[PDB]
Amino acid sequence: ALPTPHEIRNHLDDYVIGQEQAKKVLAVAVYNHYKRLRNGDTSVELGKSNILLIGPTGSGKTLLAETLARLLDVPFTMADATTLYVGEDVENIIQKLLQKCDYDVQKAQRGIVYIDEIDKISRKSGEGVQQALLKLIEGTFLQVDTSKILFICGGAFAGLDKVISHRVEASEGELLAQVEPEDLIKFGLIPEFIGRLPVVATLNELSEEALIQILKEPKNALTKQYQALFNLEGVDLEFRDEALDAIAKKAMARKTGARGLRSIVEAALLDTMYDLPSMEDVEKVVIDESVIDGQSEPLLIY
Amino acid sequence: ALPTPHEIRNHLDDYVIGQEQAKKVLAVAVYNHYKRLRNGLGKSNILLIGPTGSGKTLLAETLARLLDVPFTMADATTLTAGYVGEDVENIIQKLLQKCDYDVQKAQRGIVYIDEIDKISREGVQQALLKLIEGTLQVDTSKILFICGGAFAGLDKVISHRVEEGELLAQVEPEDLIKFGLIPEFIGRLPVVATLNELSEEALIQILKEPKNALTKQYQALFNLEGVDLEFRDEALDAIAKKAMARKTGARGLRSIVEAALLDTMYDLPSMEDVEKVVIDESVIDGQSEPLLIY
Amino acid sequence: ALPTPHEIRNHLDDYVIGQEQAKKVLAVAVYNHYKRLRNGDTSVELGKSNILLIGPTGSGKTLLAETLARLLDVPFTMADATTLTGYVGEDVENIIQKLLQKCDYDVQKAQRGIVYIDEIDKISRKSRDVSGEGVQQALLKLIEGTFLQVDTSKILFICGGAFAGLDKVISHRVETASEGELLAQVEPEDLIKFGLIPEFIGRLPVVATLNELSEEALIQILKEPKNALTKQYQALFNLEGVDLEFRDEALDAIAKKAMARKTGARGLRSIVEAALLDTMYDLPSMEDVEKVVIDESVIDGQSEPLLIY
Amino acid sequence: ALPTPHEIRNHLDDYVIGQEQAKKVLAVAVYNHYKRLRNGDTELGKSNILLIGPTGSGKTLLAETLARLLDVPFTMADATTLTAGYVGEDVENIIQKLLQKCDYDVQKAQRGIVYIDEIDKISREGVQQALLKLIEGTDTSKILFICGGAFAGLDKVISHRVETGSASEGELLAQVEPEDLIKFGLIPEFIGRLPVVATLNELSEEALIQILKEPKNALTKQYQALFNLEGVDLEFRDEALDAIAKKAMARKTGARGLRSIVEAALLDTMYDLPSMEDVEKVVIDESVIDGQSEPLLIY
Amino acid sequence: ALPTPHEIRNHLDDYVIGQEQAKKVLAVAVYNHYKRLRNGDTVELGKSNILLIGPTGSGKTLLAETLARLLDVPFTMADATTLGYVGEDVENIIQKLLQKCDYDVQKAQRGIVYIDEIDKISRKDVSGEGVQQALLKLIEGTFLQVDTSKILFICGGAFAGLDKVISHRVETASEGELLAQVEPEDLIKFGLIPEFIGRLPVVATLNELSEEALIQILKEPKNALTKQYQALFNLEGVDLEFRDEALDAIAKKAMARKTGARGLRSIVEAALLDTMYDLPSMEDVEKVVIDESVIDGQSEPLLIY
Amino acid sequence: ALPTPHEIRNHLDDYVIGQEQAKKVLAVAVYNHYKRLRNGDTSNELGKSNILLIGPTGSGKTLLAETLARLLDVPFTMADATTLGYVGEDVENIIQKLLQKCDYDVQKAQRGIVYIDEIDKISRRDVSGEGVQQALLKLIEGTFLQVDTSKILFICGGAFAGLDKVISHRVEASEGELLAQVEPEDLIKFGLIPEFIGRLPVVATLNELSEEALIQILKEPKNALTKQYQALFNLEGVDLEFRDEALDAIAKKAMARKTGARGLRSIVEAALLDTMYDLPSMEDVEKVVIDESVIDGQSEPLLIY
Numbered sequence A: 001a002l003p004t005p006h007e008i009r010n011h012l013d014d015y016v017i018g019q020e021q022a023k024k025v026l027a028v029a030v031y032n033h034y035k036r037l038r039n040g041d042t043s044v045e046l047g048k049s050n051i052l053l054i055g056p057t058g059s060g061k062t063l064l065a066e067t068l069a070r071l072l073d074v075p076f077t078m079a080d081a082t083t084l085y086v087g088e089d090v091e092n093i094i095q096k097l098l099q100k101c102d103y104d105v106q107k108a109q110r111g112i113v114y115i116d117e118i119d120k121i122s123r124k125s126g127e128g129v130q131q132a133l134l135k136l137i138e139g140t141f142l143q144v145d146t147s148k149i150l151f152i153c154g155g156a157f158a159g160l161d162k163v164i165s166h167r168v169e170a171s172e173g174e175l176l177a178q179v180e181p182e183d184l185i186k187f188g189l190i191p192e193f194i195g196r197l198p199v200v201a202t203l204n205e206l207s208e209e210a211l212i213q214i215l216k217e218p219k220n221a222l223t224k225q226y227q228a229l230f231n232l233e234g235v236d237l238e239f240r241d242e243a244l245d246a247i248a249k250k251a252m253a254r255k256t257g258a259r260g261l262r263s264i265v266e267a268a269l270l271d272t273m274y275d276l277p278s279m280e281d282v283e284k285v286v287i288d289e290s291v292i293d294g295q296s297e298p299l300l301i302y
Numbered sequence B: 001a002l003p004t005p006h007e008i009r010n011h012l013d014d015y016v017i018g019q020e021q022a023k024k025v026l027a028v029a030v031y032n033h034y035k036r037l038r039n040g041l042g043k044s045n046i047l048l049i050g051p052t053g054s055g056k057t058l059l060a061e062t063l064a065r066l067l068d069v070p071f072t073m074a075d076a077t078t079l080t081a082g083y084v085g086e087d088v089e090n091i092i093q094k095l096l097q098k099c100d101y102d103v104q105k106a107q108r109g110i111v112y113i114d115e116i117d118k119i120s121r122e123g124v125q126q127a128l129l130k131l132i133e134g135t136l137q138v139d140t141s142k143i144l145f146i147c148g149g150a151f152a153g154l155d156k157v158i159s160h161r162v163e164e165g166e167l168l169a170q171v172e173p174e175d176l177i178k179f180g181l182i183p184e185f186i187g188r189l190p191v192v193a194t195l196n197e198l199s200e201e202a203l204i205q206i207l208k209e210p211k212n213a214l215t216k217q218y219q220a221l222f223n224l225e226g227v228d229l230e231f232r233d234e235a236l237d238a239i240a241k242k243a244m245a246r247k248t249g250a251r252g253l254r255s256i257v258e259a260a261l262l263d264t265m266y267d268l269p270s271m272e273d274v275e276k277v278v279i280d281e282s283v284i285d286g287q288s289e290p291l292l293i294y
Numbered sequence C: 001a002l003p004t005p006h007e008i009r010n011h012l013d014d015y016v017i018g019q020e021q022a023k024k025v026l027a028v029a030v031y032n033h034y035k036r037l038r039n040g041d042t043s044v045e046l047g048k049s050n051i052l053l054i055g056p057t058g059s060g061k062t063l064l065a066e067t068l069a070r071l072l073d074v075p076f077t078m079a080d081a082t083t084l085t086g087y088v089g090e091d092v093e094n095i096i097q098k099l100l101q102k103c104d105y106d107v108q109k110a111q112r113g114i115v116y117i118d119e120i121d122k123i124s125r126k127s128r129d130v131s132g133e134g135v136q137q138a139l140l141k142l143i144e145g146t147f148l149q150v151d152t153s154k155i156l157f158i159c160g161g162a163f164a165g166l167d168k169v170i171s172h173r174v175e176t177a178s179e180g181e182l183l184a185q186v187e188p189e190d191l192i193k194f195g196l197i198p199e200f201i202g203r204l205p206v207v208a209t210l211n212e213l214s215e216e217a218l219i220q221i222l223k224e225p226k227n228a229l230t231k232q233y234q235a236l237f238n239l240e241g242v243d244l245e246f247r248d249e250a251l252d253a254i255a256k257k258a259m260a261r262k263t264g265a266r267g268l269r270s271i272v273e274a275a276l277l278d279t280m281y282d283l284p285s286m287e288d289v290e291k292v293v294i295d296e297s298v299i300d301g302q303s304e305p306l307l308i309y
Numbered sequence D: 001a002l003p004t005p006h007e008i009r010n011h012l013d014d015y016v017i018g019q020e021q022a023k024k025v026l027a028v029a030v031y032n033h034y035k036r037l038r039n040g041d042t043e044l045g046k047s048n049i050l051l052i053g054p055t056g057s058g059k060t061l062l063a064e065t066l067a068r069l070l071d072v073p074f075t076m077a078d079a080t081t082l083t084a085g086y087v088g089e090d091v092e093n094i095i096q097k098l099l100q101k102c103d104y105d106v107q108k109a110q111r112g113i114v115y116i117d118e119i120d121k122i123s124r125e126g127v128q129q130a131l132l133k134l135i136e137g138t139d140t141s142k143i144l145f146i147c148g149g150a151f152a153g154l155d156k157v158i159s160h161r162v163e164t165g166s167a168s169e170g171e172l173l174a175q176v177e178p179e180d181l182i183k184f185g186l187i188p189e190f191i192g193r194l195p196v197v198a199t200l201n202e203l204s205e206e207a208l209i210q211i212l213k214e215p216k217n218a219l220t221k222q223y224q225a226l227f228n229l230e231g232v233d234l235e236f237r238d239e240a241l242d243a244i245a246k247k248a249m250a251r252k253t254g255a256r257g258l259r260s261i262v263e264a265a266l267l268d269t270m271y272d273l274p275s276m277e278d279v280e281k282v283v284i285d286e287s288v289i290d291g292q293s294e295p296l297l298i299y
Numbered sequence E: 001a002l003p004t005p006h007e008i009r010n011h012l013d014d015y016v017i018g019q020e021q022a023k024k025v026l027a028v029a030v031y032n033h034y035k036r037l038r039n040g041d042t043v044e045l046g047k048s049n050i051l052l053i054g055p056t057g058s059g060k061t062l063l064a065e066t067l068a069r070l071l072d073v074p075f076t077m078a079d080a081t082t083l084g085y086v087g088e089d090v091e092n093i094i095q096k097l098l099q100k101c102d103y104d105v106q107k108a109q110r111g112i113v114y115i116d117e118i119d120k121i122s123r124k125d126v127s128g129e130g131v132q133q134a135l136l137k138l139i140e141g142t143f144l145q146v147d148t149s150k151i152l153f154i155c156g157g158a159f160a161g162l163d164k165v166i167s168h169r170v171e172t173a174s175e176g177e178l179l180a181q182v183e184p185e186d187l188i189k190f191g192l193i194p195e196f197i198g199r200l201p202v203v204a205t206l207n208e209l210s211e212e213a214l215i216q217i218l219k220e221p222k223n224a225l226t227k228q229y230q231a232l233f234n235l236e237g238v239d240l241e242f243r244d245e246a247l248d249a250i251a252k253k254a255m256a257r258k259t260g261a262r263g264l265r266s267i268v269e270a271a272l273l274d275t276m277y278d279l280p281s282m283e284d285v286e287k288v289v290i291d292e293s294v295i296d297g298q299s300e301p302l303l304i305y
Numbered sequence F: 001a002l003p004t005p006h007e008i009r010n011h012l013d014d015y016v017i018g019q020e021q022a023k024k025v026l027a028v029a030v031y032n033h034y035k036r037l038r039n040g041d042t043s044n045e046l047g048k049s050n051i052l053l054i055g056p057t058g059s060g061k062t063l064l065a066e067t068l069a070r071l072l073d074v075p076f077t078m079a080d081a082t083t084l085g086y087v088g089e090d091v092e093n094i095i096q097k098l099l100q101k102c103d104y105d106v107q108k109a110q111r112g113i114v115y116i117d118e119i120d121k122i123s124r125r126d127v128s129g130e131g132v133q134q135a136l137l138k139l140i141e142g143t144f145l146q147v148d149t150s151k152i153l154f155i156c157g158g159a160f161a162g163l164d165k166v167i168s169h170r171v172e173a174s175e176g177e178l179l180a181q182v183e184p185e186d187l188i189k190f191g192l193i194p195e196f197i198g199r200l201p202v203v204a205t206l207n208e209l210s211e212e213a214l215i216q217i218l219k220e221p222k223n224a225l226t227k228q229y230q231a232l233f234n235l236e237g238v239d240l241e242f243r244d245e246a247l248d249a250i251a252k253k254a255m256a257r258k259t260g261a262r263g264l265r266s267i268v269e270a271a272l273l274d275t276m277y278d279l280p281s282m283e284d285v286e287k288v289v290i291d292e293s294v295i296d297g298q299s300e301p302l303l304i305y
């Protein structure tokens, strides 16, 4: 049983905050996609229903993609347009989709693929990727057809906010709503590629939980770096969950996104790293009062 | 039996509005092309020049369907490399893919190359040039090549010589030379068509008549929802106006329709009605919701 | 075995029409070039023999260059002088890696290659200039010869160009006929005043001039050749049960239209197609005997071709 | 034994006045950098620095001092001399010079420090991505990179951001963010290589005055030594020293414009001095500001 | 016994006319420089390196040479335009200084080096400023084994655009008033790097010579043009006389051509050309050069037998 | 007993045609140069009297230099500015060659004359090329030969193509009239450094080609046109012979077209075009090029089997 767009958007409210319009768009796009897949097209035409996500870094683009897969118990796989002989590395995205699908051709065709940082391959070699990756969107020894699978392409599109303004001539959100296929053309994306991404949802707000993860999960997350720096000091650095969240809020209030996370952590651990080599303690705990208030000093355990 | 240029242009009037001269040119070019193949001799290759969303791509597809001939697209920008030479032959394997791997019917195929004006300086102009002449073993000498493009600066070079629809008519092979296209390449595109900026009635029929028109698609999507989707004439016209005001042409039609039927497709599977009527006030004003009939 | 200049020019007559003098010059220049390499220069002096093509756009400059390569099974590569006009200094060597690409990275065969630079007349700094001249010397390093390790001393360099103003400077000098007669009086000092630097022109000892095709020349190309345009359409209309007749006043009218556009013989087809367009359109929808193409149908383009039932 | 950030900042107080926050930042950045090298890393932050301060605020002086305090090979380089494809091979020149002053010792060279001045001048780009290759390391992974610059327009972009609806430069530059440098002209991939950011304040009048007195090589101490070997005692009245500081600020030359001011004032004196027989020469304020009255002479 | 700045400037008045302020600056700069070497520095001590800024033919090079002769000190020139391999060509300026110093390390360290056309290497570029940093290592001081810390460095240049940058700052007269307002920051915007200008604390400026200035240059200097030709004709048994109306006529011709004092010789040579040609083929007493011979260039020099 | 400038110019009329003004200048310059050395300059100033030749290719610049040496039985040696850090020791090579043709006599070597061709080519690679100007400057000044380069006369030739343009943008007739208005500042903007031009006070200008000058350029040079075609025909088993009437006939055609030496090749190619075309299709011994083959262009080159 396919979940109605109402139910889809509803469950997205549990994992992602805000972006009500973008989720309303994804709900319909996803619904129509599988409402078409479980129909085998037509025994007539039908809209591919692919998606193009456009939002700031840490707005929840990746989070939304993963959630849509879990809500439909469908095999999900990611891929960066940056890390894309690469014509045989693009087909790798498929074998990975099968890996998490137990090599089931049918369930693999029902899968979802998310390509991050599409805005990075806009020729304005990376251009040729738009074509190699385009070969999948259309559909061609897996024997699996890359037609049935849903393709979601994310990206921040920094300059996109400018091209739209030079055309429509409010806030970035109001501008990204006026986004048009021709705007992405001038940005660097080729016509044949954009025509393959009909649905277009924009994100305007940043996601607290998205930023919180960027501080933890990534192999090179800020916490992991400072914990390694303090580590070679013989001192264990501990970030409390209330602190990480407090860091995410300070980033949003400044609209600096994920790029403004480092500047917040540095200011919080500066005083500590200064007079740290001049002490002899065990570990330094970072609380929320040390971030938000910035009044109290990080706890020190001797 | 080959359809006379009269019949070809006539059926093009059903899918595309206006551009009567460009269609008159394509009709003859296409007719002569297959009139040459079916008798065992000009290459008769075409070069489309028109604004974005004028119907360049639509015309190419239609010409294929009207002749039950395998059709395949390709963006020239994707070609602009040394390894892409083996990707230039990729356009063929796709043509064969949609042709059931038939060497004979693949030679009768139509190939469209979008954004030729984008590669105007060069390596691709000479690499893709190899196909135009003809070299899967399938010879590209038989297949028809249609190269599209907007050619923004072309309107200027022509003026500095002749000194938009009237200027593009005075277009000459030497004008494309100064634009960036190499001589050996332009000589392979004898036939050159020109498309004028589409009108309202133009966009209206593109929403209805084409076998894959937007309305036909959504009427089929709502159809598998047990709901009949009805587009009022006042709504279609309302959609055409929105498209021109944004200068997106035909390419900006989908983006308009999607936003207008977005809310409806969202809470549709959560209802039990008979049909939804889309009026003008639902598109232009975007305030009133589409009529629902239970 | 090396093809004598006679054989070289002979095979050039198959791919290119006219330009008998320019081909006579290229034949000798090319022959002497490889006659120098296959003999290892001198175990004594020897001219570089680098060529400079000067002809209108669509006169066959590029076509001649390619043919000379195919006739000698030698790796050929092009390059536009406009796309060159400091980082481009490392882009000038790009022309070499491309020559190796089509040479399967064989150093010896690559040295036997031919390089054609189009639009040299565009980088002449005369009344950006400082940047455009920087290429004349950057490309000059090649003509002489220096991680492909390949030397550019062996490869033949052919530089093409239309040289619009060149026809004027020569006239202001020889002054005391036609363009073909004036371009024959071309001198290294004429190219100097045009914008080319002395050190560069001295590297192009051979200068070939491609005269503009005469009306008579074009008229014959539309008739004589076994694959002439008229013979093509007369065959196309023939399989329609309709005889196609080209009046001599029309053929001459097409030649004039071609010259006025400077498209040469390459622009003859585009003219013929536009004139028989409407005809081929509503032809299969009729039942006549023959269609006569007059001059008023080509030049004026107003009157329709005569129809005889 | 590595010097604690406390000791590092302490020794910086001897060579540079003020900038206590910037020095607190450099102390930690430098300490962490070598604390990472002496432990062979392990993730670990590159810990590269970006200096932002007015001309003559002590950006270059701070860089040199950090090297001397760690007996580490130091070398400079101007970013304006990089802005060019052949310069890609000139980017490595900065390395051969680092080896020159390092006696060609690969290990000690890797422990070296490189200062690039006038980075704010190359903000559009080809250099930003060329010099970028070094920051990563091809090795250039071990050496510390300090990029200086005045960043004139930076004070404006920050204001158009930190504003709220409708302070001093030292307060605005503190609110500096990686995105501010983005709009300024620096590319994202480059700024991400300079995690550590320090901001310098325009040396106050009192700051300049001290630079003319306290430093063991202060201008006054030099000229007093010059006049000393003439049998003439040179006295700098306090009203005169501050007069020189103001002349320096009004010109925005910072501390670098201090010498040019002192010379012009003592020029006429140094000319007809060897042709006299006096005891001392007193320099008042009227000799600097007005430049009208001649320095007091006492036979 | 070191010459007092008074004596130094005084002897400069014999070789160079005008530029009294620039010479007052050089006198002090030079005096302080050697007053520092003879006392072995110390405590700090200002380098006192000089930067000459004046029009072409204002006497920048002449001043540099004279300062060397007045102190019997080895002198050597070098054009900044001639300056990675050039880094080893920079030390060539040193081996040449030793050549004219008989390879005496001590006397070589007391030498003076003049770099002309510094305004030409200002990046306003990659290889251009590479000299500002290479030639920089010298100013600080480094197989001669000779240290360059001791040698005096004088960098000359016309600095065409410098007159403009100063104006865009001093704004709220003549060139000689604007160049006086010159500041280290002005040279920064011009193309010179900060680290380089800080090595040239001293900055002397020269004005544009006038008619009366040029006239004296043709007479007063011990190597004046008139004295040279009067000596050339002297060894011909012919006395050469220059009327005051002629010398002034020469100055005007020089100013109208904006060549300054550098274009004085080219005018004198063309005037006495025909005379020097058919001179050895005569037997006269003296040749008088009138004004009509220079300005008009029509009438021939008066000939007395 | 020195030959007066009158006698010097007179003997130059025998070897070179026209250029009466340039020869009048060289006569005086050369006379003054040796009139200076034979008097030991001045016991206990004096112009270097060095020369700078400026004329089209094949105007007789080189011919004039050689003649001045033969007329004074003085050791002469050439050198190209093109063939010039290591080259800093290749500049002194010009001296050892001067000694070679001087039998290693230091005194007679100091009385020698050195001609540097194509000086206009080293005017700012801009770094290396320009550097030759100062490296070559060391000689003009004067420094194991032990010989001083101060005594030897230096004549620097060159075509200076762009020089005709810079002069026009300044004085704002014919080229000759323009080159007469030449000034030291014009050569400055051209690429020559100030310190170098000041060493060449004398500036002579040519504007007329010489038949005998061009005839030599077709024969003497190791890379002469005749030697190149004789080598090309050589590898065809055919000896190419250029009659003296033909070479002279080529020089004429070159001058009538004012194309100078640059237009010599375009003349020879056209004359040997038809020959090189149907030559590989024959079996003869040699091909003789007569005058009637060049001028009239009617008769075909003689063929001997």
Ligand SMILES: Nc1ncnc2c1ncn2[C@@H]1O[C@H](COP(=O)(O)OP(=O)(O)O)[C@@H](O)[C@H]1O
Pocket: D015, D016, D017, D018, D053, D054, D055, D056, D057, D058, D059, D060, D061, D062, D148, D211, D215, D254, D255, D256, E194
């Ligand atoms: N904080 C300081 N204390 C003492 N002297 C200083 C200070 N800052 C700069 N100076 C003096 O200024 C001179 C040049 O300053 P510089 O390093 O160029 O500053 P910036 O890096 O801001 O250009 C140095 O020689 C130094 O003596």
